[PDB]
Write a protein that binds this DNA or RNA. Sequence first.
RNA 1: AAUGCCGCGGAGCUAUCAUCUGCCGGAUAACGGCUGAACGCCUCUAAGCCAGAAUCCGUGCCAGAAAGCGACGAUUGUAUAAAAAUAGAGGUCUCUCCUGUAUCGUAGAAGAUGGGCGAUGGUUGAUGAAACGGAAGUGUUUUAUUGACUUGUCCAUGAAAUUCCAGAAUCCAUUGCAUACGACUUUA
RNA 2: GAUUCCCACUGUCCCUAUCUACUAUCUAGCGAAACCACAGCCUGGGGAACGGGCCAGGCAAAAUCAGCGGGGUGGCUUGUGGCAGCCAAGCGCGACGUUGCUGGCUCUUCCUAUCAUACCGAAGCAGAAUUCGGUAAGCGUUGGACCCACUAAUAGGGAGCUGGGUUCCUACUGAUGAAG
RNA 3: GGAAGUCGGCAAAAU
RNA 4: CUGCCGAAGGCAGAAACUCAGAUCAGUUUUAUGUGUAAAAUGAGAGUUUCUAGUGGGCCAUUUUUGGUAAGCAGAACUGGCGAUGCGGGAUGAACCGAACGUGAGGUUAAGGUGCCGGAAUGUACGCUCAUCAGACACCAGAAAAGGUGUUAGUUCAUCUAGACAGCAGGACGGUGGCCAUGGAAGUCGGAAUCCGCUAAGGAGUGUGUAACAACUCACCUGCCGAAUGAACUAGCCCUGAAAAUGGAUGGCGCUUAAGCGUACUACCCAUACCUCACCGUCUGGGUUAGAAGCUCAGACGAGUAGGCAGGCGUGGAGGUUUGUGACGAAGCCUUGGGCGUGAGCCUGGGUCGAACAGCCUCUAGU
RNA 5: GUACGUGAAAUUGCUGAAAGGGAAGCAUUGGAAAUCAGGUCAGCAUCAGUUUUCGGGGGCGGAAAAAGAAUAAGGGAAGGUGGC
Lengths: 365, 196, 30
Amino acid sequence: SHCKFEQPRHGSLGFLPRKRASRQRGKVKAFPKDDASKPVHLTAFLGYKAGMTHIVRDLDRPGSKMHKREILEAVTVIETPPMVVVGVVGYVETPRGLRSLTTVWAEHLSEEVKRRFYKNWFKSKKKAFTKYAKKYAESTQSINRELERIKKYCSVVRVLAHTQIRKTPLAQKKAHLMEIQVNGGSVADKVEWAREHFEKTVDIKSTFEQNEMIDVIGVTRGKGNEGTTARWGTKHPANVQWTVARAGNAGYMHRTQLNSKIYRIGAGDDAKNASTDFDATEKRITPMGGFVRYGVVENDFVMLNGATPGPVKRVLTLRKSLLTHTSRKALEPVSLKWIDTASKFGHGRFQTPAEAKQFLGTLKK
Amino acid sequence: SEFQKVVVIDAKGHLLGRLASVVAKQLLGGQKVVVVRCEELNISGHFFRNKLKYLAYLRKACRYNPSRGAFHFRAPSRIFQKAVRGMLPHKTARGQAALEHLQAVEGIPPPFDKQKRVVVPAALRVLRLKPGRKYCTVGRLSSEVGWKYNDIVAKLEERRKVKSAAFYQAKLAKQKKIASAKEASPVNQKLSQFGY
Amino acid sequence: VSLKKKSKRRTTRLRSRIEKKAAESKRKQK
RNA sequence: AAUGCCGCGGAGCUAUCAUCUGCCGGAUAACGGCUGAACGCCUCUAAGCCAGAAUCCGUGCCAGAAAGCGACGAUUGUAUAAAAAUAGAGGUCUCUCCUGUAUCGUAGAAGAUGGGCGAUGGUUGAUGAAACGGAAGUGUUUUAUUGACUUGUCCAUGAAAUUCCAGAAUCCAUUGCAUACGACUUUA
RNA sequence: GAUUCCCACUGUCCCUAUCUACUAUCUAGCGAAACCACAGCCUGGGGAACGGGCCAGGCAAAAUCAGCGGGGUGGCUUGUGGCAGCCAAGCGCGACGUUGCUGGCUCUUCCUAUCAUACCGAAGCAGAAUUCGGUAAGCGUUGGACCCACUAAUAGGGAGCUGGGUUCCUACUGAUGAAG
RNA sequence: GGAAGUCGGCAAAAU
RNA sequence: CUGCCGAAGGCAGAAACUCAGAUCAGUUUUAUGUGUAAAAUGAGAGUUUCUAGUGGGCCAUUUUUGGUAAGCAGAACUGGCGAUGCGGGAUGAACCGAACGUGAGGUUAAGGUGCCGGAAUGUACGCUCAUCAGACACCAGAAAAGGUGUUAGUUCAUCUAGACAGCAGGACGGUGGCCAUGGAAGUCGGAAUCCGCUAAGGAGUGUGUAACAACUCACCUGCCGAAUGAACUAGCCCUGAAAAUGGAUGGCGCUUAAGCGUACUACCCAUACCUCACCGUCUGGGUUAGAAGCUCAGACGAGUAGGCAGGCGUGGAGGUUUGUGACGAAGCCUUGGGCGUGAGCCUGGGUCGAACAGCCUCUAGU
RNA sequence: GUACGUGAAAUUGCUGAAAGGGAAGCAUUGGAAAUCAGGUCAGCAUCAGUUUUCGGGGGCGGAAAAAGAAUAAGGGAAGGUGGC
């Protein structure tokens, strides 16, 4: 007998299994297609979700209902200190897939990336990469051989880069290490670019430029085990099938938000990063009283539209869009008018203590 | 027709069912078989009908946990393996051990490109199919059913053919030198009445 | 693969029923 | 004062009661055509080709084989390799295929001990250095130095009663980005 | 007392969210019972009763934890009525024709026999709107007392509950987990 | 917003 | 526990005795019309008597009547099932073989020889391409038929007096025949539809035009040089509708088949057939040199109800064994050994502590 | 050793051996390990019974094979050769 009253499916079959992500760091399951017409350029970056605020910008969107009006948008602030390139990986195309032929590491590895290789840094004798450092000092002709192998046989070149988590106001001391595929140019060109970028820091100012459309990928917030109500949106003799909604894990899944716009890439060393041409009023992106549960932003930061997966102080990966999409929203410029840095720890009412002090009387303290 | 440890079959121009049946009989006999270049196996019937056959094969899946449902393999080597194992008693230890004696690959990998590759006449399309009959290629049906490694194999096969052609030219030159010295040697005519 | 909508193989009741009613058809035409 | 009652109430949770985000490559079906026979004309079809649906298959997105795998780090006689077509191929106008019943190899008390004659060769072992091989490089060539054996041919010795087959991680501790408990993410 | 009406009120509802206590969770101690041929995956077949054992396939890797309760009879059939006559391809029939008359509340998936959306062909199809037909099941097919609205449309079917009417195991979902 | 739920103001709020 | 006989929808067996017969036959000839009577072949044939179990039903077969969209119903015979394992049909109560003691060897039946699967990817000749082929199995429901798919045929047609087709042309003039009309000239529409010319130009096959006009065929001439056309039948192929999860010629697969049809060899194996050994039952011959025995030979072997016969084991009683036993009875355990088809028996090792067993009879709370 | 003669089975623990991918049990043949036991196991020749598979020789039959070859008559022609 047929179903009398039909409705669309309560869930999405393309996101199950609703199991816990086997990773804390956002994985890049697709890098943008390579092209030898364009020489070298990176394609991804790694940041930490500090917090989110709201801004006011003048919308120059031709044909829109609110063309040339002042609009309010929620924005996410991700602190992006420069990442140190410490390795290069060569990938060879095989009838079985992309296979990592070899890996070359930089001579001097910081304690930041060395902590990644241990579950307990203090008990360890710190013997990792010691003999690699010895052979690097002794004979560079060997390392030249693997790079020759990479530029001779490998088709995809990726750089191992770790984030300087020490710079961020995070209690974690392990640095996050990932591979960013070097898109563009010949394999030799990518290998050279990796060599002259060994042990130096690549910054977000060189990766992204404040107007492009990116994919932000990360692990979502954990809501714990949940019943069918909030896990799935639920209101003949057989056996229960996979399509039936069930009770289980809700949250902590690997997700990918597409089409995120950078409204601003600000520099940490600059003290005008939260000030705009319509605002003046010297201030920093950190809200009054510091970000709730994160701290004070002191390094380079990126302001994206909307919301990104995961809670504060979690690591996000920002990749260049795989496919070009020239929607006028993705092509329009952004001219910020005002940024809110009031206290998010409660109902804040003042932007900076300086401008709060004139309105308030002389406090006895 | 002598028992070798390993028989490398160049599956180019063969018929899927006929080659599978011959291989399945050899595995039960206890012979290691390596079927290289599986993107060139031929199947009788025109391409659209074969793709309809395969796309009907995808339709078979469990209604609970398609993860436990039928596993549809798209690689031409895996297509040949499915054809072979269907001709074997793989539910028993004998058939399961027989499957372990078969290595079906895509292209001709370096460990097997430097070894003689015999062919099966009982499976060859040229000898077994009436001229004027439509057929298809597994390496083509695979690309339009989901297989995504066609370009890499074709490129790595052009490299292999170039290297093999260079090797054969060098060996042919050496064989020409040996062949020239042959009649120059005298006993080859002096007492050759035995037929050699 | 079958590549059909209706199975070419038949059930034992069905195959037996043909000889049941094919013979009766010859009885009727007689 | 079993949360006595009321107002406000951060944090957390949450609301299409709030905000953000949701993409492109092939193959086709109906159908419209190109060339073109069958059938000396014609013809979208027979051989072929083009365009063509929210369709099918991939890309993208989620999971990651807990019996799929790679890279990195530290480490207490087992003889024989072109390719392609089969209504055609290759070699020097000419020649060959028409299957490996072919080719390489093949003696020795399981491979002994010597003597010549003829050739600078073959088997090559050991090291030592060059090049090449990344599809799973499972190896290939080039040598060099030597130590060997050198059936190439011709001679002499012994065989037998084997007398008819057999440095790390974890617990305790810590963290809250996580959490029924495990697990996880940090510190230690 | 029952019914109706107007006003009034409110989480019955749109549409669920939040808060507290207990239980469930783990731990120390104590500690049962029902039930029990043996057990434990699905598809097609096994004449039936299809079943779990049989046949042919998909498959198949220890040990486990918390949930939830699923599992304890034609190859039928479909779109075209009944009587009489005229032909007559043919073998007394005789085909098509031709002429004579009066049950509803929520739920997973599948099928196409398509209501809407996509693309096509035909029509006095000028345009707009529209009719019929083809491929097409990817995606939708509502809110209220046959009625009246919305909607692009409100298409047809296959395989936990209540009203008026008669006087263990396995599956599904998450979580660990020894091992080359 | 105010029975639009349900066979229906079942149950709470208006006192 | 074993062996033998063995049904029933008045039977099978037991005992008592005839005749070495023309005495009977689920039979066929001969004669007379399925009846009767008097040659073939086979068999030893019989009569009275009493005494267990059953008197059901399913499936198919050939003979008829009543029937209808459509099946269906009621009779008689026949068998199979039932009491029946085995080989094959992928598997199966009714389909094809084959009736069963334990083994060795050989050979087959039915069905098969691409792989699963033991056996020819044998030989020879044809047919078929299916974007939802076939292996099907009187192809019987849809079933009546459709198809510019293919291969064969059957019957009529023209054809070097030039076949079909193809291009070049003619395809006319009375006449715009007559009613019919805004406008109809062959072609909106109403009867034909005549004539001069021929080799032919239809009061006209279609398009078209308000009407015209113009093109086309159906009809002829020029070039061009050989076969061509129409109607039916047969085989294969497509179609001749069917839904609801994944999906089945058994699977994989197969397209000069591993599909369809035929022909010929070779090959595979059942509990079947043949040769031999052995077990048991029955039958027959012989046996005065455990007679309850010995010996020779042949045939035979499913088995429910039922009938008959011979054995194993348990408690107790009488007889016997100069019977066994504290130097270890009975019991119990055991990966030890042996015997018997079997019921069961003996024994080695360990434990154990006081009774126990063989043989012949008797007996039963066996 | 009183929870006491002998002390079975169901069931349980330990040790040793072995097996294990959605059953387990059982049967047939044999290997492997363990164990026990008594002449054991082979090869060939000549035979007997059964049987399978190749080869040779010789008769006898048909149209006393049909064909065919070689060699004399005549006839006919082609899918027509030399010639024309």
